[PDB]
């Protein structure tokens with residue numbers, strides 16, 4: 001009866017009453033790209049096409065969480081802090097006395113099923129809690145809360161607190177924007193994801209560049225996250241989503257996503273974009289996971305990953321979804337350390353980068369090169385290493 005559709009518009013010519021006229025609804029007018037999410041009856045899609053200036057009509061595609069409960073089972077096994085093997089594998093703990101992410105200009109946004117925001121091992125690091133489900137940006141704690149468990153896990157992988165209890169993240173001091181883009185079942189429309197990406201550059205104040213100097217990420221006066229981490233993917237590549245991705249990147253934000261769990265020969269979207277670092281999964285033997293989609297950029301612990309889980313609990317999951325937050329957390333350390341030393345963050349790399357000069361190049365060079373020498377289709381450049389990466393960033 002009604003269908004959701006994302007129109008790419010001439011914002012000069014385009015009038016939302018026109019769609020309202022044809023029985024439609026306006027879902028979300030993008031702040032950062034000339035586009036608008038709409039509901040139209042099926043027959044109107046014709047009409048919608050040359051509304052002035054509707055220049056492109058794109059359908060709303062489905063993306064899916066990329067982490068699942070592990071074969072080995074189980075919880076936090078002791079009433080003290082556990083360090084999950086993957087945290088130690090990506091060489092995080094030795095960085096912390098330099099930084100643990102707690103540099104205050106630095107935020108990581110995590111677009112997922114939501115967060116258990118008052119989790120005793122998360123709560124202090126959760127700086128903003130948004131949902132974008134169904135096109136409506138909500139900031140109600142009841143809407144922004146994790147109905148699934150996955151985003152809670154993925155977040156504790158980046159940022160669980162270094163303390164008494166539970167687990168610890170790669171960056172246990174970094175601030176987290178939780179942007180709920182996937183429903184209770186872990187399904188998400190691209191539109192909601194695109195909006196989430198926009199919410200992550202806007203930050204809590206709804207403005208991309210308050211103060212007008214074209215510095216977004218790494219700007220103390222702006223609320224923009226510096227990392228957007230997506231433990232999700234789907235098979236569709238739409239141009240308004242890719243445009244949003246180019247908005248993030250241009251803001252100087254590092255974008256990180258799961259390669260996918262299908263054993264496919266290349267990454268899903270958004271991982272498959274040049275501007276995103278595609279992350280594949282290793283196990284505790286440094287073998288590539290056979291589920292891990294091939295031709296990632298880097299790989300990271302992704303099998304039998306103990307992390308935070310609702311409600312105030314912990315669980316062990318697996319997938320390229322679990323690998324991803326290790327990479328994101330390793331970026332957060334890079335940028336935090338870099339900022340703490342120089343007045344400034346590093347630029348996002350490119351995929352090709354083998355320089356000490358960007359986040360991505362440093363990643364690529366300090367990674368632990370497993371399998372065949374150099375970048376390979378299983379490991380990418382290899383397994384990411386916080387300690388060596390932060391040493392490069394500051395050397």
Ligand SMILES: [Ca+2]
Nearest residue numbers: 161163165167
């Ligand atoms: Ca802890």
Ligand SMILES: [Ca+2]
Nearest residue numbers: 212213215219
């Ligand atoms: Ca600024």
Ligand SMILES: [Ca+2]
Nearest residue numbers: 211213219221
């Ligand atoms: Ca400024």
Ligand SMILES: [Ca+2]
Nearest residue numbers: 105107223224
């Ligand atoms: Ca920031």
Ligand SMILES: [Ca+2]
Nearest residue numbers: 118119311312
């Ligand atoms: Ca709770």
Ligand SMILES: [Ca+2]
Nearest residue numbers: 370372373374
């Ligand atoms: Ca290799």
